[PDB]
Amino acid sequence: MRTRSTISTPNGITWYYEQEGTGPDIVLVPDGLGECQMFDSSVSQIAAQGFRVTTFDMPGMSRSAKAPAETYTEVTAQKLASYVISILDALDIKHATVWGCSSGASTVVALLLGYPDRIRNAMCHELPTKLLDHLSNTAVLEDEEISNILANVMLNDVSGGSEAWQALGVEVHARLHKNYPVFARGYPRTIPPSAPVQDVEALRGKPLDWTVGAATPTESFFDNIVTATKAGVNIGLLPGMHFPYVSHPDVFAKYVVETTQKHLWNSS
Amino acid sequence: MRTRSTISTPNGITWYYEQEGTGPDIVLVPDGLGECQMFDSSVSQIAAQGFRVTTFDMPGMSRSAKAPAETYTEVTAQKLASYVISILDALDIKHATVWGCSSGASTVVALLLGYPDRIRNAMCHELPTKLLDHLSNTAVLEDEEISNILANVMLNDVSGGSEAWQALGVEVHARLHKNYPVFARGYPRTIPPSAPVQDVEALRGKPLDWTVGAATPTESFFDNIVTATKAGVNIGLLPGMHFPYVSHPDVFAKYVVETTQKHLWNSSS
Ligand SMILES: C[C@H](O)CCC[C@H](O)CCC/C=C/c1cc(O)cc(O)c1C(=O)O
Ligand SMILES: C[C@H](O)CCC[C@H](O)CCC/C=C/c1cc(O)cc(O)c1C(=O)O
Ligand SMILES: [K+]
Ligand SMILES: [K+]
Numbered sequence: 418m419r420t421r422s423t424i425s426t427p428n429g430i431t432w433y434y435e436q437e438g439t440g441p442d443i444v445l446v447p448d449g450l451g452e453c454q455m456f457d458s459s460v461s462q463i464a465a466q467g468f469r470v471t472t473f474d475m476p477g478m479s480r481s482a483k484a485p486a487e488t489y490t491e492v493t494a495q496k497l498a499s500y501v502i503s504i505l506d507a508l509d510i511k512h513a514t515v516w517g518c519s520s521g522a523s524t525v526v527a528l529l530l531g532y533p534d535r536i537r538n539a540m541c542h543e544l545p546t547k548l549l550d551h552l553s554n555t556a557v558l559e560d561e562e563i564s565n566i567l568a569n570v571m572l573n574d575v576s577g578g579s580e581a582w583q584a585l586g587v588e589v590h591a592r593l594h595k596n597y598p599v600f601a602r603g604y605p606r607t608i609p610p611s612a613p614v615q616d617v618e619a620l621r622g623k624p625l626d627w628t629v630g631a632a633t634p635t636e637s638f639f640d641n642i643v644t645a646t647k648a649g650v651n652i653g654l655l656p657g658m659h660f661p662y663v664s665h666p667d668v669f670a671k672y673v674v675e676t677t678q679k680h681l682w683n684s685s
Numbered sequence: 686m687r688t689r690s691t692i693s694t695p696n697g698i699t700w701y702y703e704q705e706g707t708g709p710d711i712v713l714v715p716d717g718l719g720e721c722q723m724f725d726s727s728v729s730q731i732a733a734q735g736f737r738v739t740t741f742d743m744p745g746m747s748r749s750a751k752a753p754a755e756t757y758t759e760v761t762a763q764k765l766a767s768y769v770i771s772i773l774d775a776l777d778i779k780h781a782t783v784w785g786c787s788s789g790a791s792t793v794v795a796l797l798l799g800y801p802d803r804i805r806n807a808m809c810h811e812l813p814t815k816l817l818d819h820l821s822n823t824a825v826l827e828d829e830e831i832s833n834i835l836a837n838v839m840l841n842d843v844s845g846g847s848e849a850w851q852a853l854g855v856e857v858h859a860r861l862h863k864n865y866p867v868f869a870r871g872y873p874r875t876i877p878p879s880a881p882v883q884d885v886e887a888l889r890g891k892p893l894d895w896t897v898g899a900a901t902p903t904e905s906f907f908d909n910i911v912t913a914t915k916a917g918v919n920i921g922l923l924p925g926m927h928f929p930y931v932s933h934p935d936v937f938a939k940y941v942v943e944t945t946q947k948h949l950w951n952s953s954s
Contacts, residue, residue, distance in 0.1 A: 631903060632904070634902070635897050635922065636900070637903075638903070639922060642903075642907065643910065646911050646915060
């Protein structure tokens, strides 16, 4: 019942995508590691509630690696939003609910603000607005050292569940190992400054639902809570840290379903 | 240069307190464990910047244990604020900057709202507004089990620094051992519903500086960040978790001094 296929867009990207279900469109945008297998359990649970769910690997990452260098270098929320619109155009998805974490969160807020006719509502999780020198400095290391360091960071610092993270399995971790250097050299210097949350008044009244991880250290996304509250945007918590769709897939799925249902009611 | 003494207030409490320094008054209200030795390093560093610093063990706790049962049972922010005003009256402290964490945070916001002529400015850290059934349920246990459970929670989960926590020393931990059952039976069921943050408009424009621990799990005091932001109150982070004066005493002292200095400049304007 799950489609697993590839599709080429006129910007040069060959996307790997997955799709399951019928009904209103929900699109799950990966975090910066660009790996859509992290959504696998949740895709079936969401689709089973009457939705068409689409996800994809991000350009330059995992099975979407056949892409021009511009799509995975000097990456911004606005570039990623343009790329997501390209694949939604290719798949004839005219109106969608979107979810994203991390650079995915920056991407879905850019999607909602830039393409309002295309976006029913956006769920953003842990949107990075601050430069981290420790992360930006990994870009000058050798690929194998980047992969070793960032594999450790993801498991021990931000996975929000070491057993679930490791249970993604050897095939997923082998793809992430190859993504870490692409992510390190493309994302951490350019993503945070591109955060589309500098204009608080532009967020006010928008169909945005913002979350942070319950277990995440307060300092990590303190600024998200402040910004959301200043904008009057719905702000709450999911269990775990940076990857709730990995750590707590059933809670994640229920959240996506209930949030989409609330906006479908509000739209009529 | 530290005064270490006792003072009896007509509400029945015999307080243990400490004082150091001369200058504008800064008062350090303990968290619910009620133990003012946790401020020892910071009291000297703050006083050295030209302040008179006062702290005290809280009623029923540590060396302030000679107190009526009303002062350490069914404890509310409003009761604690009335008790702090009683010791400030007894020490002739008319106008003070105040710090408090946890129930001490609830106390200092209650002091600022309820006694505004007495409070130059308040610094509140990790103010509890939510009931926690797992903590409330400890009240029905025997004293020794309460002490073992909460000693473990403070050391390993919320100290923000296990080595600094242990370095409080054997005498402090012997006092905290006796305080854990008093705290368990008198605080967790009644402090959160008494939180003086139901009226966001009452906080607006008040000389309040609110912090949360940088390492604290987001869920613990997420509501503090939301409430402070809604009220336009200065909200920020200190290193560590629930006990910044234990985990990061020099950062804590600097924050108390700089915040007090900011309000002294503003008061003159
Ligand atoms: C050795 C170093 O200190 C590493 C320690 C710091 C941790 O890496 C923080 C981990 C999560 C970073 C998210 C993030 C940040 C960003 O600026 C752009 C992004 O796209 C993302 C994302 O995961 O997508
Ligand atoms: C056995 C369980 O799992 C215990 C686990 C939970 C952590 O103990 C508490 C985290 C911080 C809250 C303290 C607190 C709460 C309150 O309702 C009144 C107070 O006065 C305080 C205070 O420290 O003053
Ligand atoms: K789950
Ligand atoms: K320090």
